[PDB]
Amino acid sequence: EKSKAVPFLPRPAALDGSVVGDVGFDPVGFTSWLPLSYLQEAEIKHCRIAMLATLGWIVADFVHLPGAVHEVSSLAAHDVAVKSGALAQILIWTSIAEAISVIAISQMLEGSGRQPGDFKFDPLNFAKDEKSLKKMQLSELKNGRLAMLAFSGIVTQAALTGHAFPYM
Amino acid sequence: ERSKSLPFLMKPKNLDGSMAGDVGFDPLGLSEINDVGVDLYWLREAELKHCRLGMMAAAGILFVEILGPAPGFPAGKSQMDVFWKVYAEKPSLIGASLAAIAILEVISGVATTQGRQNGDRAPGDYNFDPLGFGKDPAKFKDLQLKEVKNGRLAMIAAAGMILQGVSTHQGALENLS
Numbered sequence A: 001e002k003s004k005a006v007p008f009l010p011r012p013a014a015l016d017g018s019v020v021g022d023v024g025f026d027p028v029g030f031t032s033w034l035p036l037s038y039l040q041e042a043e044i045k046h047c048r049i050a051m052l053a054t055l056g057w058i059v060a061d062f063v064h065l066p067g068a069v070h071e072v073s074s075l076a077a078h079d080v081a082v083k084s085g086a087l088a089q090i091l092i093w094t095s096i097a098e099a100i101s102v103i104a105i106s107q108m109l110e111g112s113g114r115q116p117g118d119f120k121f122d123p124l125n126f127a128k129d130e131k132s133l134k135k136m137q138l139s140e141l142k143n144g145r146l147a148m149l150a151f152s153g154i155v156t157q158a159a160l161t162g163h164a165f166p167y168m
Numbered sequence B: 001e002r003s004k005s006l007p008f009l010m011k012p013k014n015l016d017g018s019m020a021g022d023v024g025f026d027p028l029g030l031s032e033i034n035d036v037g038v039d040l041y042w043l044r045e046a047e048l049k050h051c052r053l054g055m056m057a058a059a060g061i062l063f064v065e066i067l068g069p070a071p072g073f074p075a076g077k078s079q080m081d082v083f084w085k086v087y088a089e090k091p092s093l094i095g096a097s098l099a100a101i102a103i104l105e106v107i108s109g110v111a112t113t114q115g116r117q118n119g120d121r122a123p124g125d126y127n128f129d130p131l132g133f134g135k136d137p138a139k140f141k142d143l144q145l146k147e148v149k150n151g152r153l154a155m156i157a158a159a160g161m162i163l164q165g166v167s168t169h170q171g172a173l174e175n176l177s
């Protein structure tokens, strides 16, 4: 009762405390008719994709790969990269990763034990015990949400005003 | 048995004494509506939202007309017509404000319906007391009465300002003198 985020709204009844980044924020009750693991996986995937996208947009408006095709702004880079076939390679490998993801999310939903977003990818450690893993999961979630909103703002401002890196 | 405000009318059944500003002024018996998701809880929440919105709007009109606009913002003293001048030059501000108000209003409606269902939240309550001006009781009732009276007065005032600006196309205090 009385979820932490919205103090005047009831607790979403599906987010008690046992999830990283769980401040009880679900006013429209998306968790009431969708699996929690599915939504967590979707959120983490969005976080990672948008973090990479924000970093790439900002960097590519500064540094360009050698070649005349890579001499466009990130706003206009989509139509150039799709014509050159640059985005085709990313599409192919992302589709391979996403088919393996289809298998992984199916197994997670039907038992297994794989945590949402846990691909066990960890060449370095950066997370030795449970406490470090929880803290870094919270950091990843917060940074990913911030980067999703940041990429949203960057794209909207750049489309509104065709400016360089300062999209004001 | 008779309403305090209207002695020629019987006391409205649903308005005993609880809500701040209750004087029994329900001649049409609207407090007894229990249909289309509308009841005393919904009516009180709507009244409080109207009170707060009217207070904010009246304060904004008076502030802008007396102390002038903020730097970088248009002038004209007609608040119903300066809106189109702001939108003509800063449409993004208006759009962002509208989107924020839309999200907050969706949250407000969800909260109203939930609090009506599992009764734990008083109508118009959003737990918004950052400065702790209404922590203790015996002052909360007085603050509720002050808010309700000021909000009704500002509702009437803001409706008047809207109509005056739409019709006369002049400022509020311009109409005053």
Ligand code: CLA
Binding pocket: A049, A052, A053, A055, A056, A057, A059, A060, A061, A063, A064, A065, A066, A069, A070, A071, A072, A073, A074, A077, A078, A081, A086, A087, A090, A093, A094, A097
């Ligand atoms: C969402 C991810 C994403 C997407 C869709 C793109 C898309 C694009 N980038 Mg880009 N970029 C990204 C992230 C991304 N970038 C990141 C994170 C960086 C920082 C290193 C850059 C740095 C960058 C530069 C410097 C340039 C581009 C350019 C371009 C355009 C054409 C060439 C190209 O594909 O990039 C080539 C990308 C690189 C050389 C660096 C990519 C490094 C990756 C993203 C990090 C490692 C992630 C890993 C491989 C994930 C594995 C995927 C899995 C399925 C196997 C194209 C529109 C070029 C352009 O035309 O600019 C307008 C260009 O000059 N990008």
Ligand SMILES: C/C(C=C=C1C(C)(C)C[C@H](O)C[C@@]1(C)O)=C/C=C/C(C)=C/C=C/C=C(C)/C=C/C=C(/C=C/[C@@]12O[C@]1(C)C[C@@H](O)CC2(C)C)CO
Binding pocket: B080, B081, B083, B106, B108, B109, B110, B113, B162, B166
């Ligand atoms: C279904 C729903 C929402 C909901 C729900 C949920 C989501 C299901 C959740 C719950 O469970 C139930 C329920 C029902 O709550 C309904 C949504 C509400 C609506 C339909 C929104 C309406 C808002 C309209 C407003 C507030 C417009 C005001 C216009 C003004 C104009 C201003 C002007 O300046 C302009 C522009 C020109 C100037 O010249 C002069 C004037 C004219 C003054 C003043 O502001």
Ligand SMILES: CC(/C=C/C=C(C)/C=C/[C@@]12O[C@]1(C)C[C@@H](O)CC2(C)C)=C\C=C\C=C(C)\C=C\C=C(C)\C=C\[C@@]12O[C@]1(C)C[C@@H](O)CC2(C)C
Binding pocket: A141, A142, A145, A146, A149, A160, B091, B092, B093, B094, B095, B096, B097, B099
């Ligand atoms: C800034 C913003 C969001 C900021 C979010 C932040 C900081 C989030 C922080 C967190 O996530 C972290 C970091 C960690 C989480 O655990 C906790 C929180 C705290 C939640 C959203 C802006 C959101 C801004 C929005 C939605 C603006 C919308 C504007 C519109 C629609 C206007 C459109 C128009 O103006 C045009 C474009 C042209 C005109 O011609 C037509 C019209 C329509 C007038």
